[PDB]
């Protein structure tokens, strides 16, 4: 190579983490300003020009706010759960292609990597809620466990239908395969279902049961203050963007367009971000449109509506592939 | 190993040794002669050697101790540096290659 | 050494010892990955018999192919040097134009179709060699002679046309 | 001719070693805390 | 006179360090101990998921990416469910008072050494390697076996549904009995 | 070598356990894990995809066992009311 | 057109009373070579199960509700149909396995196949599946109707690995090709 | 109220579509697979749609005896 391995690895990680953590801060302001417009409001417009420094004041305010360790709380776990949720939520950005193979890890199995990292971070929510040893946080954590028993099979079922078309499990190859057609056209029911599960996966509304404010006070994060609360917020909003990126990876062609490398690489980055930003809007639009579902009804919806339909596609879709001679070669090509 | 299916989608590295042992048994052992299978003994040790490597581990231990004790005792003139080794067989580094090969 | 792919390799081992005088010397091919992919279908069109003879010799001596088929291996190396020299003395600009595009394109052949269609017509009229891929579906036009490549990032230009031997403009 | 005095200790070590673990199993199934040196 | 053997450090394209397998190995044993010595059933199950994560990270570092990810994917959901049953079926406070004595240490030592000595010979040279003249594994390259290298998930798929489909059919029957049996014994009676 | 050490933890955590039956059922999960690890490590040494296939089928039946166990444990708890194992 | 090799694959030899025709016959051959007795027995066997559950109901009623017995008939009806079809398939395939008297099957095997030879068409036909996939299919289904009590399995793959030397078919057809030419000469 | 399938299958399929659509349409979509496998392939080959040849995944070793090649021998090296 031309320069050091460690430096190339260094600047690539920075170019991924730093712009993403900046992107996370603006989704929080953007949601507050988007719902307000739907609510005939303005949203943040006085912490920085047009309100563009609001997330930083919120972040800085909490890192200077006193932490409390409850006497009834198992304290090592009280701190371990938010730290697990944050680290393991942010790890999911290590396999996103911002171009063909332009990922921190172009892994051959990056889809399974994302399922492992998301599942491990939800276990922090469960642990932190239980550790608090307060009723509402206890009821919050039990809902989060019910919720993962609801959406995890749904996403894993949905993605397996994308892998049947792509044949790869590598995020770049799936995007490259969509140069034929975006997977939202042939897999239109799967796109709706995967999007529904992603909203449930992120504990976003209408599925905000674990942290519901009108039923529990803050659910799992009710005893959590200062930096611990901020760890859970960055995990949640970083999960929203990551799931919007993954939905764009799997159904909307990823980075596909709708000095010379820099000009080209920019178009891939914009194209992925534009499609991600549209799906980020759909989340915020969804929180603003609907009531909260009841947690019994979310479990029944995933288990008697979504999964029965997804199992039937899992049968139907390969039968269409063998019939039309369109099973993808599973070798390395794209 | 014995199956025929390895890690890359290609065949297992010890499969030829397994097929020879099965071939030997079927083609030497019989009901008429119980002792044809004694021909299969060397074939059986080789299948275990391709599996565990104890005999090839034992040879390299002997030669490696013999080799290091010889090079250690041997007269030393000039060590070829890593950069010189990295320049072996390049396009415009003839001097470095000649030093490495001592030619 | 073993065919297992290494996971903890921090070192490399060399061997300055040369093959014994009893084995005839063959100058090894000096071409790199991108040039060899651009010349592969011309190596195949000239050295198929030699390539096919090496592999049939190895399948004729199981476990001993490395030591008992050395003459065939020297024959393939020599045969494949002939095409490389021939392409060099007759297609040097087009050949470089193709494998350089291939180097910038992930060695994907569909990503450099206009450079292949020029290099192939130069090879066909000079070295009289022609790219053939077996069992391509007959109904569909061959993929290396399709005007539109669906997986190409830059669309094939309308002016650039595919090269079919035996057909004039 | 065999060394009975040398043999018997080997015979004692084998059989006596078995009773060691049957002793250890007795200590484990005890309902009262006595300690490892019991 | 003659050098004849060159040991060179690999600049790029070099693998991981094998030191990390010794870190994961000790942590995996530490975590295994804490699963059973801990007085609280939730730190015990927290150490349980940590144990599977260290075993899975070890599996990824040796190149078994699918099974390590598949282990972590399946055992995180499993540990989450195990958490769920501890909450329902265990009094946490009274169990943290469920103190145990070490009358079983002498049994531990004897039972520990005797099994370990016996099963150390049962394990093969491939594994007991790397327990001042060390051996070095040497690897090279082939081209005939590299024409279409598959990923281990594809290598298993190449045979899991044709050559060994009996195991899949039997596997499916075990899952069916668990899906029917685990529900027959715990269903609300109405 | 970690294979034996893990297998001994799960065997004693099953036999020397004086806490509760979920920890009984956990220790089985540890023993199977160590055996799967031995099979996975051998299969890489012998270039065998069959060992990984064997591993995957021990994961599927190890989850089937733990579901049947947790189901039986619930049945027992509904009637007994404690899944605590009692000494003295 | 002699292949010069008629036993390409190693096959299991079984001690049976009758001649072996095919250890992995295609599903269509098992049906085609079935005797009228095989239809008669399989149909009686399918009738046996719901007729059994009827007699048990008549002699010893279950005291079931108003619509439970009709439900049980539908299950008993299916299981007897499923059990009687496996019975009928097993009766024909044993004549192919050499494990039943098969004089009729042998001659209609020698005719059908030697017809395929002189037609130049593959004895066992053509397969979409790859040559190795054919092997896996042959090694999954050969002699597989012996396990019908536990796990059913039928051959739907046209493969060439059927356990029999094919030389007798070639060695035969040419004699029918020798006599055909001579008979044409005197005309 | 609710029809029984075995008494009136068509009135049941109408009731199942209207009242239990997610379950009923799972069975349709899933059943549509084996219908696809039984009808599309025959009609595809009917209209000349030909399944493609398998792509090479191992070197294709030619059958038959070696061709007795003359040329590219050791003398030609210089
Ligand atoms: C429930 C409803 C089930 C519906 C089944 C699917 C619809 C039928 C599809 C169809 O019409 O295929 C006809 C088509 C006819 O081909 P053809 O061109 O007319 O003649 C050429 C020869 O057949 C020979 O052709 P060939 O040699 O060139 O190639 C061999 C064959 C290769 O195809 C095969 O080998 C498939 C046969 C598998 C082995 C037999 C398994 C049966 C044992 C069941 C085990 C039960 C466990 C308990 O290739 C095919 O013909 C492709 C067939 C279509 C794809 C294969 C998928 C069919 C199987 C679907 C399984 C459904 C599972 C349902 C779940 C059941 C358990 C809950 O192929 C078949 O005959 C497939 C038969 C499948 C029966 C086994 C399932 C029972
Ligand atoms: C990191 C930046 C990423 C770039 C994308 C966002 C650009 C806009 C965010 C920075 C906003 C600029 C600061 C500002 O609002 O000026 C008003 C502020 C005034 O403070 P203010 O918050 O009270 O704004 C008052 C105006 N109202 C009330 C209407 C909102 O000006 C300054 O404070 C002087 C600049 C000091 C801060 C400089 C560092 C800013 C962060 C790095 C850039
Ligand atoms: O593990 C690394 C792995 C990445 O996969 P791969 O690139 O194939 O491995 C290279 C290893 N040098 O990555 C994976 O697949 C596993 C996920 C990363 C490993 C765990 C990351 C968190 C570790 C700290 C946790 C602290 C609590």
**Which subunits sit against E, judged by 3+ Cβ pairs under 8 A?**
A, B, C, D, F, G, H
Chain A residues with beta carbon closer than 8 angstroms to that of E70: 112
The fold of F1-80 is Helix Hairpins (1.10.287)
* A239 three-class SS: helix
Which class for D12: exposed (0-12), middle (13-18), buried (19 or more C-beta within 10 A)? exposed
What is chain B's alpha carbon radius of gyration, rounded to the nearest angstrom? Answer: 23
Under 8 Å between Cβ of G4 and H65:
no
Q: Is the peptide bond before E147 cis (omega within 30 degrees of 0)?
A: no
Under 8 Å between Cβ of C38 and E39:
no
Longest dimension (CA), chain A: 65
B16: CB partners within 8 A, 6+ apart: C62, C63
CA of A117 to the centre of ligand 3 (A): 10
H20: CB partners within 8 A, 6+ apart: none
Q: Residues, chain G, total?
A: 187
C-chain residue closest to A177, CA distance: C151
**Tokens linked to B75:** 């007269």
Rounded Cα distance, G17 and A112, in Å: 56
* Closest approach atom of ligand 2 to CA A51: 30
What is chain D's alpha carbon radius of gyration, rounded to the nearest angstrom? Answer: 15
Is the minimum CB–CB distance between E40 and chain A shorter than 8 Å?
yes
Burial track G137-159 (b if 16+ CB lie within 10 A, e otherwise) = bbbbbbebbeebeeeeebbebbb
Domain spans of chain H, in order of start: 1-78
Residue E179: C-alpha distances to residues A203, E89, F63, G91 (Å): 28, 21, 11, 36
Burial track E8-19 (b if 16+ CB lie within 10 A, e otherwise) = beeeeeebbeee
Chain C interface with E: residues with Cβ < 8 Å = 1-17, 55
**Tokens linked to A292:** 């909260």
| C12 membership: H or E segment, kind and range | strand C11-14
Under 8 Å between Cβ of E161 and A318:
no
Rounded Cα distance, H77 and H73, in Å: 7
> Is A53's C-beta closer than 6 angstroms to any atom of ligand 2?
yes
Which residue, F17, D10, F6, is CA-closest to E119? F6
Query: Residue A317 phi/psi, 5° resolution?
Result: -65, -50
Question: In Å, what resolution does this model reach?
Answer: 2.8
**Tokens linked to E26:** 């000790």
- The sign of the CA dihedral D29, D33, D34, D36 is positive
DSSP string computed for C80-134: HHHHHHHHHHHHHHHHHHHHHHHHHTTT-GGGGHHHHHHHHHHHHHHT------T
* Rounded-to-10 torsion of CA A280, A285, A291, A292: 10
Query: Residue F20 phi/psi, 5° resolution?
Result: -170, 165
Query: Residue C12 phi/psi, 5° resolution?
Result: -130, 140
| DSSP structure class, residue F20 | B
Which residue, G102, C9, G10, is CA-closest to E11? C9
**Tokens linked to H78:** 């210089």
Query: Residue A327 phi/psi, 5° resolution?
Result: -75, 130
CB contact under 8 A, H66 and C55: no
**Between helices F2-15 and E19-37, what is the axis angle to 10°?**
0
| DSSP structure class, residue E8 | E
Residue B25: C-alpha distances to residues A333, B32, B49, E165 (Å): 44, 14, 18, 28
Which E residues in the span 33-72 are in contact with F, Cβ-Cβ below 8 Å?
A: 33, 35-36, 41, 44-45, 48, 51-52, 55, 58-59, 62-64, 66-67, 70-71
Is the minimum CB–CB distance between E126 and chain F shorter than 8 Å?
yes
Query: How many contiguous H segments (helices) and E segments (strands) does chain B have?
Result: 5, 0
DSSP string computed for A155-193: HHHHHHHHHHHH----HHHHHHHTTS--TTTTTHHHHHH
Atom 8 of ligand 3, residue of closest alpha carbon: A107
Query: Residue B90 phi/psi, 5° resolution?
Result: -100, -175
**Tokens linked to C164:** 């079919």
Under 8 Å between Cβ of C107 and C148:
no
* Rounded-to-10 torsion of CA G45, G51, G56, G59: -130
- Residue E5 belongs to a domain: no
A221: CB partners within 8 A, 6+ apart: A128, A129, A137, A140, A211, A228, A229, A232
Which class for A252: exposed (0-12), middle (13-18), buried (19 or more C-beta within 10 A)? buried
Longest dimension (CA), chain C: 57
- Residue E161 belongs to a domain: yes
The tokens 């030669």 sit on which residue? B63
Which class for A164: exposed (0-12), middle (13-18), buried (19 or more C-beta within 10 A)? middle
* Rounded-to-10 torsion of CA C84, C85, C87, C88: 120
Rounded Cα distance, A167 and F12, in Å: 44
* E7 three-class SS: strand
Which B residues in the span 18-37 are in contact with E, Cβ-Cβ below 8 Å?
A: none
Chain G residues with beta carbon closer than 8 angstroms to that of E162: 133, 136-137, 140
Half-sphere exposure of A97 (CA within 13 A, CB side): 25
Domain residues for the domain of E69 are 18-185
Rounded Cα distance, G76 and G54, in Å: 10
- Residue E75 belongs to a domain: yes
Rounded Cα distance, A275 and F40, in Å: 41
Q: Which of E24, E28, E57 to mutate to test the pocket of ligand 3 (most atoms within 8 A of CB)?
A: E57
**Tokens linked to A59:** 């972040």
**Tokens linked to H37:** 């496998």
A100: CB partners within 8 A, 6+ apart: A172, A175, A176, A255, A268, C106
Q: State how far residue C3 is from chain E, nearest Cα, in angstroms.
A: 6
Instruction: Answer left, alpha or beta for residue C128, where phi above 0 means left and psi between -120 and 50 means alpha.
Output: left
Method: cryo-EM
Chain H residues with beta carbon closer than 8 angstroms to that of A329: 55
Which residue, A114, A115, A120, is CA-closest to A84? A120
Which residue, B71, B79, E140, B89, is CA-closest to C18? B89
Under 8 Å between Cβ of A197 and A155:
yes
Residue A84: C-alpha distances to residues A23, A228, B15, F70, G81 (Å): 21, 11, 45, 27, 58
G20: CB partners within 8 A, 6+ apart: G14, G97, G98, G163, G164
Domain spans of chain F, in order of start: 1-80
- Residue E64 belongs to a domain: yes
């Amino acid at each position: 190579m031309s320069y050091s391995q460690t430096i190339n690895s260094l600047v690539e990680v920075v170019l991924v983490l730093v712009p993403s953590l900046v992107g996370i801060a603006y989704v929080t302001v953007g949601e507050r300003k988007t719902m307000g417009s739907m609510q005939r409001r303005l949203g943040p417009n006085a912490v920085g020009i047009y309100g563009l420094l609001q997330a930083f004041a919120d972040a800085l305010k909490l890192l200077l706010k006193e932490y409390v360790g409850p006497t009834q709380a198992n304290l090592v776990l009280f701190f371990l759960g938010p730290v697990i949720t944050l680290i393991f939520s942010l790890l999911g950005y290590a396999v996103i292609p911002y171009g063909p193979g332009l990922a921190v890890n172009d892994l051959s199995t990056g889809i399974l990597y994302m399922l492992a990292v998301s599942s491990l971070a939800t276990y922090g929510i469960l642990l932190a809620g239980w550790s608090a040893n307060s009723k509402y946080a206890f009821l919050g954590s039990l809902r989060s466990t019910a919720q993962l028993i609801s959406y995890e099979l749904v996403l894993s079922s949905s993605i397996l239908l994308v892998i049947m078309l792509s044949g790869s499990l590598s995020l770049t190859v799936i995007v490259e395969s969509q140069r034929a057609i975006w997977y939202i056209l042939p897999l239109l029911p799967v796109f709706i279902i995967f999007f529904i599960g992603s909203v449930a996966e992120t504990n976003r509304a209408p599925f905000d049961l674990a942290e519901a404010e009108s039923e529990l006070v803050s659910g799992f994060m009710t005893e959590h203050a200062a930096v611990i609360f901020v760890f859970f917020f960055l995990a949640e909003y970083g999960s929203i963007v990551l799931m919007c990126i993954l939905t764009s990876i799997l159904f909307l062609g990823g980075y596909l367009l709708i000095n010379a490398p820099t000009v080209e690489g920019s178009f891939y980055g914009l194209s992925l971000g534009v499609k991600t930003s549209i799906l980020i809007f759909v989340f915020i639009w969804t929180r603003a449109s609907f009531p909260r579902i009841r947690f019994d009804q979310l479990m029944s919806f995933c288990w008697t509506v979504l999964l029965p339909i997804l199992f039937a596609l899992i049968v139907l879709v390969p039968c269409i592939l063998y019939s039309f001679n369109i099973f993808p070669v599973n070798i390395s090509l794209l | 190993m014995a199956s025929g299916y390895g890690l890359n989608g290609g065949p297992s590295r010890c499969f030829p040794f397994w097929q020879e042992l099965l071939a030997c048994y079927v083609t030497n052992s019989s009901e008429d002669n119980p002792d044809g299978k004694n021909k299969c003994i060397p074939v059986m040790e080789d299948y275990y050697e391709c599996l565990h490597h104890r005999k090839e581990a034992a040879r390299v231990r002997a030669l490696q101790a013999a080799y290091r004790e010889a090079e250690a005792k041997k007269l030393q003139e000039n060590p070829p540096t890593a950069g010189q080794i990295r320049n072996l067989g390049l396009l415009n580094k003839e001097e470095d290659t000649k030093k490495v090969h001592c030619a | 050494m073993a065919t297992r792919k290494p996971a903890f390799n921090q070192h490399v081992l060399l061997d300055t010892t040369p093959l014994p005088d009893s084995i005839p010397k063959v100058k090894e091919i000096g071409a790199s990955s991108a040039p060899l992919l651009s010349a592969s279908f011309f190596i195949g069109a000239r050295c198929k018999d030699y390539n096919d003879d090496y592999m049939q010799c190895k399948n004729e001596n199981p476990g001993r192919g490395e030591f008992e088929c050395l003459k065939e291996g020297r024959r393939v190396t020599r045969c494949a040097r002939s095409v490389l020299k021939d392409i060099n003395t007759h297609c040097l600009e087009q050949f470089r134009a193709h494998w350089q595009c291939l180097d910038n394109n992930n060695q994907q052949l569909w990503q450099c179709r206009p450079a292949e269609w020029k290099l192939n017509k130069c090879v066909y009229e000079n070295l009289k060699l022609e790219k053939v891929i077996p069992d391509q579906p007959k109904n569909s036009t061959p993929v290396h002679l399709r005007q539109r490549q669906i997986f190409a990032h830059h669309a094939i230009p309308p002016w650039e046309r595919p090269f079919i031997p035996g057909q004039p403009e | 001719p065999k060394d009975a005095v040398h043999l018997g200790l080997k015979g004692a070590a084998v059989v006596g070693g078995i009773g060691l673990l049957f002793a250890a199993v007795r200590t484990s199934l005890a309902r009262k805390n006595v300690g490892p040196w019991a | 006179s003659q050098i004849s053997l060159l040991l060179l450090k690999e600049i790029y394209t070099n693998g991981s360090t094998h030191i990390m397998l010794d870190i994961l190995s000790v942590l995996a044993v530490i975590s295994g101990i804490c699963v059973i010595i801990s007085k609280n059933p939730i730190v015990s199950v927290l150490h349980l998921i940590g144990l599977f994560a260290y075993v899975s990270f070890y599996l990824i570092l040796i190149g078994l990416n699918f099974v390590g990810l598949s282990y972590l994917i399946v055992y995180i959901g499993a540990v989450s469910i195990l958490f769920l049953f501890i909450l329902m079926l265990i009094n946490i406070r009274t169990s943290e008072l469920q103190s145990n004595t070490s009358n079983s240490i002498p049994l531990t030592i004897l039972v520990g050494i005797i099994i370990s000595s016996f099963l150390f010979k049962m394990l093969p040279y491939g594994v007991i390697i790397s327990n001042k003249n060390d051996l070095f594994f040497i690897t090279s390259k082939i081209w005939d076996g590299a024409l279409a290298e598959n990923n281990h998930i594809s290598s298993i798929g190449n045979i899991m549904y044709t050559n060994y489909n009996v195991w899949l059919i039997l596997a499916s029957f075990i899952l069916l009995l668990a899906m029917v049996g685990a529900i027959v014994i715990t269903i609300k009676p109405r | 070598n970690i294979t034996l050490i893990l297998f001994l933890i799960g065997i004693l955590g099953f036999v020397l356990n004086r806490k509760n039956i979920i920890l009984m059922l956990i220790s089985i999960e540890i023993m199977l894990l160590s055996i799967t690890f031995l099979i996975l490590l051998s299969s890489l040494n012998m270039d065998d995809i069959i060992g990984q296939t064997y591993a995957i089928y021990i994961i599927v039946v190890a989850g089937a066992e733990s579901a049947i166990g947790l189901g039986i444990l619930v049945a027992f708890y509904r009637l007994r009311g404690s899944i605590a194992i009692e000494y003295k | 057109n002699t292949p010069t090799q008629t036993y390409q694959f190693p096959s299991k030899t079984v001690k049976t009373d009758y001649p072996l025709i095919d250890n992995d016959p295609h599903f269509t051959r098992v049906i085609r070579y079935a005797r009228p007795s095989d239809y008669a027995h399989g149909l009686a066997a399918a009738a046996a199960g719901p007729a059994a559950l009827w007699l048990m109901e008549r002699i010893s009623p279950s005291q079931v509700g108003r619509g439970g017995f009709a439900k049980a008939m539908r299950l008993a009806g299916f299981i007897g149909l499923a059990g009687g079809f496996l019975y009928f398939y097993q009766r024909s395939i044993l004549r192919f396995y050499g494990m039943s008297e098969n004089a009729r099957e042998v001659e209609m095997d020698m005719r059908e196949m030697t017809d395929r030879v002189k037609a130049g068409l593959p004895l066992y036909g053509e397969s979409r599946l790859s040559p190795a996939m054919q092997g896996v299919a042959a090694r999954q289904s050969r002699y597989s109707a012996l396990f019908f009590g536990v796990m059913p399995w039928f051959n739907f793959v046209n493969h060439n690995q059927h356990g029999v030397d094919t030389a007798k078919y070639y060695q035969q057809a040419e004699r029918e090709l020798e006599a055909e030419r001579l008979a044409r000469e005197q005309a | 109220t609710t029809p029984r399938f075995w008494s009136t299958p068509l009135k049941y399929c109408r009731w199942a579509a209207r009242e239990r659509p997610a379950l009923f349409f799972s069975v349709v979509i899933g059943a549509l697979g084996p219908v696809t496998l039984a009808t599309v392939p025959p009609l595809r080959r009917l209209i000349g749609d030909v399944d493609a040849a398998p792509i090479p995944l191992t070197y294709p070793i030619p059958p038959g005896p070696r061709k007795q090649l003359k040329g590219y021998d050791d003398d030609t090296e210089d």
